[PDB]
Design a protein around this ligand. Structure first.
Ligand code: BF4
Ligand code: BEF
Ligand code: BEF
Ligand code: BEF
Ligand SMILES: [Mg+2]
Ligand SMILES: [Mg+2]
Lengths: 151, 143
């Protein structure tokens, strides 16, 4: 499976330039004009990472970040904005954002950061998959189903 | 409540020192990062608050020296010449805080008191274990 990304920015042209950059870097990139749209495809099972702009109509990037945090704190999120400042960046990192990048930005900073974030996301997902695979026995023995009500 | 405060801006350094003293800290202030560093140790019970752009060694270089000295000695960076990538990296590298000038007094003070409490808890645990011969496991050496 190729590394994947959900990319969000209301600036359509920059969105496409960023998608083009990331696919050059090896990612499979789904893009969206808004955070709410992207959320329709996000869940704790998401194999990739989220790269999102901040200032958008409706739900802004910081609000999306909180929703991702609540959905799965192990799902990496990188914020990119032309409207941030020192204090916002510090707070976002402390809140757990994977990276906080200012526009205009070097494509290599974005790429290297996405690359590492996705590798990290993959390690988490492969371990979750192994854990589930190891549960196959109990489920097939019907042990899981019979013990179900004990949770 | 102890603090080493470093800034080449004399008026600001004096004002930060009064503000920190008002908050209850005993402050040792310096214009030079290396003079400040020379009076530090891994036994220092306080925190370090340093400016970034300065003659001689800069605050980021001083921070890297403190990390190697004792990664549990909190460093708060304050600067009027920072940007987003520099602040992000400082926090990711372990800086306790990164504050842009101009800052509100209460922002500097709250960050200092929390950092100091964090350091105080670290030193107490270190003190308590050395006091207790019985807390030691592993290799012993005997005559
Ligand atoms: F002028 Be000073 F900063 F050396 F005190
Ligand atoms: F609108 Be984004 F924050 F650049
Ligand atoms: F896979 Be264990 F038996 F829950
Ligand atoms: F000169 Be300091 F970095 F404000
Ligand atoms: Mg925008
Ligand atoms: Mg200075």
């Amino acid at each position: 499976a190729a590394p994947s990304v959900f990319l969000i920015d209301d600036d359509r042209d920059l969105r496409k330039a960023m998608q083009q950059t990331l696919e050059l870097a090896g990612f499979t990139v789904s893009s969206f004009a808004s955070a709410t749209e992207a959320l329709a495809g996000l869940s704790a099972d998401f194999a990739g990472i989220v790269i999102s702009d901040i200032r958008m109509p409706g739900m802004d990037g910081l609000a999306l970040f909180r929703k991702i945090l609540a959905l799965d704190p192990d799902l990496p999120m990188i914020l990119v904005t032309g409207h941030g400042d020192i204090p916002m960046a510090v707070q976002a990192i402390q809140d757990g954002a994977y990276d906080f990048i200012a526009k205009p930005f070097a494509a290599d900073r974005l790429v290297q950061s996405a690359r590492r974030a996705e590798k990290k996301r993959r390690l988490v997902m492969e371990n979750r998959s192994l854990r589930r695979a190891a549960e196959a026995a109990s489920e097939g023995l019907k042990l899981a189903a019979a013990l179900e009500h004990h949770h």
